Amino acid sequence: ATPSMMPQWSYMHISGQDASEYLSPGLVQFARATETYFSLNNKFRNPTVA
């Protein structure tokens, strides 16, 4: 609810779209396919907004 600093936040994944939103769809598909033996979801940041 601070439209002033919203862009500067969304770029640093402080508040904004979720991890599986901004990523390229191909990369999301790849992460889903190889979740079992080579994890990737821990690499990326996922924001939570109260």
Binding site: D18, T48, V49
Partner: peptide, 15 residues
């Protein structure tokens, strides 16, 4: 409603 979420029986026996 729904603009509230943090956006990103036990009786005696019942096994």
């Amino acid at each position: 409603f729904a603009s509230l979420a943090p956006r990103h029986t036990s009786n005696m026996s019942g096994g």
